[PDB]
């Protein structure tokens, strides 16, 4: 049974997955995505080092492949991450002039979003902007532009494609009593009160065994920032316990503004932490107990 | 034991594998390649549709990642395929002018080879140029430029990087009685006698169960064309029988000019034909019996 169909029947938008061209041409990934998932995200093909490896000179072949495949197969598309420190070519992080970096950042945002205008439901505009203690992470963007880089990024994105839902994303937002969770709420409330067009908070949910239960309290806390949407992004769970996965799904169901869940790949051997077997399909592309538990939870 | 180390001890150059960036950042692929393989080959990041999706718009982020990784980890690198009718963008196949297509082909070859000059041991310059009956395949290059496109491609490649071994590659060269196998031998002989710089024939070896034995006769036939080198390229075997894999390895050992073997990926779930489980590691990244049989054969 399709978990995307079942989550749509419960009033949500999607159950999605990260993928890219060489996943769609190998394994059983394309067949599983066609049958069971409703949204695709680029695993790597829209990151900055993949798309703008020298200034103004874009690499779109990989991203175009994904967008085309999704349109042919009737899937929604997400995109990201537009502004991020972790996937950033050296030419960017070596700029020291505020005006120049602002224009580089706006050109990167506008070029990607314009190319796919109207085709992308969600964009992750800014990612991993917070330290664990809730202060802003001192990346090249913060150091050179200042905290205004976040408002500027979102304003620029809204102008490039008004159809898209604009997200900030981060990880370690999985516990309601962890400082980073309340900090992103505090700052997103302030930014929205200043008119910054942040439509969503995306929680990049990488859990250890037993941590699913805490998402039931963390996700409603994230929703208290008042964004129109929240999502669970790039979900995986070490051990892939049915209990952990069902708890995350039920947190989504319990939060009215949570539109859906994306998992960080199809099958365990293709995970960035494969030894923890953290996904919903095994190395032979069979659905694991957690997959079947999600099916039953969405019916029950 | 490392099959690359063992094949080197038998006088060969490499046991290699196809890979690309997202493979290296997921699963156990990087650890296995470091320990057990001596050469990497882009699974897709150097094809024409990946590298020049529109005229003059080169996309090298993926290929650059692979080349860097290989240099940092002391691995040989192969590249290709430069001229091929598969993976060719529509902008190329819609050219009807002989001078224009000649210069487009030259520029594609020269740009890729120049970027990595000195770093790439082997380039597959022309691929899949023959029909199954041994006549030349009527691709856009044959139709518009004529038969001299093959001499031109090789002469352009030799000028771009004289350090590289230049290969022609094809598939279904696995039986000595098949017309294609004899045809490529005859044509390569005559091209080399006329000074065309073809250094190698690469046999793209995609086998069904039981076909390994035929390679013991086919590979010597390919070597009779007199090229400095031959190789086994992108090897996989439906069912991954030890008998089939050992027969292919022994064909390599028996042919003095065969420099090595590349396998078409690490683990079964990442194969283009994963349901046939045709690789040397399983979906849990454990060596399969075929891996251990190769080790035993090479020790003896």
Author numbering:
A (entry chain A), B (entry chain B): 4 to 303
Article, verbatim:
One of the key active-site mutations occurred at position 50, which was mutated twice during evolution, first from lysine to histidine (HG3 to HG3.3b) and then from histidine to glutamine (HG3.3b to HG3.7), resulting in a novel catalytic residue ideally positioned for stabilizing negative charge buildup on the phenolic oxygen at the transition state. In all enzymes except for HG3.17, the unbound state is never pre-organized for catalysis as both Trp44 and Met237 adopt conformations that would prevent productive binding of 6NT. In addition, the His50 and Gln50 catalytic residues in HG3.3b and HG3.7, respectively, adopt a low-occupancy, catalytically non-productive conformation in the unbound state that cannot interact favorably with 6NT. Interestingly, the non-productive conformation of Gln50 in the HG3.7 unbound state (26% occupancy) cannot stabilize the cis peptide bond formed by residues 83 and 84 via a hydrogen bonding interaction, and accordingly, the trans peptide conformation is also observed in this structure (25% occupancy). From HG3.7 to HG3.17, no further changes in catalytic residues occurred during evolution.
HG3.17 was evolved from HG3, a higher-activity mutant (S265T) of the in silico design HG2 that was engineered post-design to reduce the active-site conformational heterogeneity observed by molecular dynamics analysis of HG25. Over an evolutionary trajectory that yielded the HG3.3b, HG3.7, and HG3.14 intermediates, a total of 17 mutations were introduced into HG3 to produce HG3.17, resulting in a catalytic efficiency increase of approximately three orders of magnitude.
